[PDB]
Design a protein around this ligand. Structure first.
Ligand SMILES: CNc1nc2c(CC[C@H]3O[C@@H](OC)[C@@H]4OC(C)(C)O[C@@H]43)c3nc(N)[nH]c(=O)c3cc2[nH]1
Ligand SMILES: CNc1nc2c(CC[C@H]3O[C@@H](OC)[C@@H]4OC(C)(C)O[C@@H]43)c3nc(N)[nH]c(=O)c3cc2[nH]1
Ligand SMILES: [Zn+2]
Ligand SMILES: [Zn+2]
Lengths: 358, 358
């Protein structure tokens, strides 16, 4: 019987690590890419914000929880809902966030306690603390005030999680570091989260428009501040090259809507970079989407045929693109894990970039 | 090695028949439903009209033909393109049809000879004669003039097909009966087609807004006019109940865009009739789309989850609906074939209607 939560590091190269997270519902190989569930993967993401508006968290619980609902019996991660509320809905206070639903007009409050309860009703295995994703750019004073509130909210998240026996005994709770791009605030945030104690630690407040150079600069000093012996989750990242560089800086877990978003808009990821399959240059191209990809799409169909389907507005085309993209991301993570395990990740990263950007 | 074309009838009940068409690329079990290829099935449909505008028939041939292009090595049926040109594009003459492409503005002529050549370039296994689908309603004089032109065009289609060695030796040619709703014209058309000689015979000019009662009335006298020992193809039909009644009247082959169209617009076919899965009554319904369906969707997911996906605009939802609908149609045809073979099709049709319309 697997434990509630156990992270083991099997191999290291520089700051990069590869290992496993064992949970009751399955093993997660790291570094891990965690795709959206409604799009192989060891863990998927549920969409807390959407689910709390349609059908409602109580309704999901009545239907048996998200695992039963989605037909997925392996681990599920849910975000805490505030990023999305603050992105797509609002009134903020020390208690939480108030907002109105575009779907039906109803009012909703979200607080650390309510966020944890919603994630409990959904039945997720990895629960995110309820935080404030500081806007970018932020002044030192605004970044500090926001980070300090998020740390108070992290303690409230911890207490709410621990009060629910079924959750505390079967799920895991991750804290989220904030502090914008400022080293001293990232340090204060890390210290506060470690004093509370979490099962894993996310780097929040990035992939919010700062650009890769700045993101990598912040990762350079921020990830070493987190406990080495716990997983590190970079929220919202990212492009294949962002993932490779973030792994080089000690990140273990990733989520991003790009594979699914790109697959709906004609973009395929390949080892030679992204391509827009609708472009006329693919109309007679008999090669598969990627010449090395092991996925079922590249086993059977050409760029020319997928180009044809998408240009025709056929749903099959978008589904084949999405399947390919999700598969590409999992192949990227497998190559990352194997190369770290084999002590050749530095060479892999160099080879990856030379070809991806050629 | 299979023959170019051989139709055998294994069992009969009333006017209904069940059997097989053997072609070089595979066996087709009849009665057969023939789904759109870009949506198990023994034969799929290519979209001649679309393919001749994008990428062009010559380009498909350069890419290896439709079998290679689509990744489908079993039989393919193509329509002759005139119905669509006359539906979606025009100037008509004894030579053919002239029309302009909305895609690029270019001009196109379609004639019996060009239609046959396009279908040759596409590489289809069952080729339709180039006909005029008479509009509905039609006067006796207009229906006769149109039918007479279609019969002259049927002879020109036969001659063009026979002139192409690779086509005459490896593909099959179907003639299309016209004559609107008029018994004497349907008889003249049947006689003309039988004198020319075809591998199979389609009933054209129906499913054009006449309604099921009138369609069945025309089938009642029209299908017996065709050679009994050759397949009978009802073009454009149809709803599950249209198919059952048409089989009762001697039809062997069907095509219809409803399974795919419905699956894109929230409608699922079930043994208890069609349902609109977006309706709120399905939001907490844990049953599969259909309680008896053997398809992979109904094996794994609920109405509530598919409702959720479609309401969320997720591509996965439309794909699961379409998979279910195509599978439902093939299960319907399997039950039709088995019941005719077992001498209980009359009972099946009665039981089907009592439940489908309950
Ligand atoms: C895109 N870059 C990016 N995403 C971030 C997120 C998650 C945003 C969630 O909403 C959607 O965006 C994503 O799809 C689902 C599956 C719904 O989950 C993701 C963050 N979440 C929290 N709690 N805190 C953060 O500081 C934070 C920062 C982010 N930067
Ligand atoms: C809907 N009812 C209906 N369809 C008919 C068709 C085929 C129309 C083709 O175009 C699309 O419609 C269909 O999807 C593809 C795969 C493109 O093929 C089908 C017909 N075709 C010919 N040649 N002659 C006819 O008398 C005729 C009558 C019809 N009645
Ligand atoms: Zn692939
Ligand atoms: Zn089904």
């Amino acid at each position: 019987d697997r434990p509630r939560f156990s992270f083991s590091i099997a191999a290291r190269e520089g700051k990069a690590r590869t290992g496993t997270i064992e949970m009751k519902r399955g093993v997660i190989r790291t570094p891990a890419f965690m795709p959206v569930g409604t799009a192989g993967a060891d863990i998927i993401l549920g969409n807390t914000y959407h689910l709390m508006l349609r059908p409602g968290a109580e309704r999901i619980a009545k239907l048996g929880g998200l695992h039963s609902f989605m037909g997925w019996d392996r681990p599920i991660l849910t975000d805490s809902g505030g990023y999305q509320v603050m992105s797509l809905s609002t009134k903020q206070s020390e208690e939480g966030v108030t907002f109105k639903s575009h779907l039906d007009g109803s009012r909703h409050m979200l607080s650390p306690e309510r966020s944890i309860e919603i994630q409990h009703l959904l039945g997720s295995d990895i629960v995110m603390a309820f935080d404030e994703c500081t806007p970018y750019p932020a002044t030192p004073s605004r970044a500090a005030s926001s980070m300090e509130r998020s740390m108070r909210w992290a303690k409230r998240s911890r207490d709410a999680f621990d009060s629910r026996k079924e959750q505390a005994e079967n799920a895991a709770l991750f804290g989220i570091q904030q502090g914008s791009v400022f080293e001293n605030l990232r340090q204060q945030s890390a210290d506060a989260l470690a004093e509370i104690g979490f099962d894993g630690y996310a780097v929040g407040g990035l992939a919010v428009g700062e650009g890769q150079d700045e993101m990598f600069r912040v990762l350079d000093f921020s990830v070493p501040m987190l406990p080495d012996d716990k997983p590190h989750y970079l929220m919202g990242v990212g492009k294949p090259d962002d993932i490779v560089g973030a792994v080089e800086r000690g990140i273990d877990m990733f989520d991003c809507v790009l594979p699914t978003r790109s697959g709906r808009n004609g973009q395929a990821f390949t080892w030679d970079g992204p391509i827009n399959i609708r472009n006329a240059r693919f109309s007679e191209d008999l090669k598969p989407l990627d010449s090395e990809c092991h996925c079922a799409v590249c086993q059977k169909w050409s760029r020319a045929y997928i180009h044809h389907l998408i240009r025709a507005g056929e749903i099959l085309g978008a589904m084949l693109m999405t399947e390919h993209n999700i598969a590409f991301y999992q192949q990227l993570m497998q190559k990352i894990r194997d190369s770290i395990s084999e002590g050749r990740f530095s060479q892999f990263a160099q080879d990856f970039r030379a070809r991806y950007f050629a």
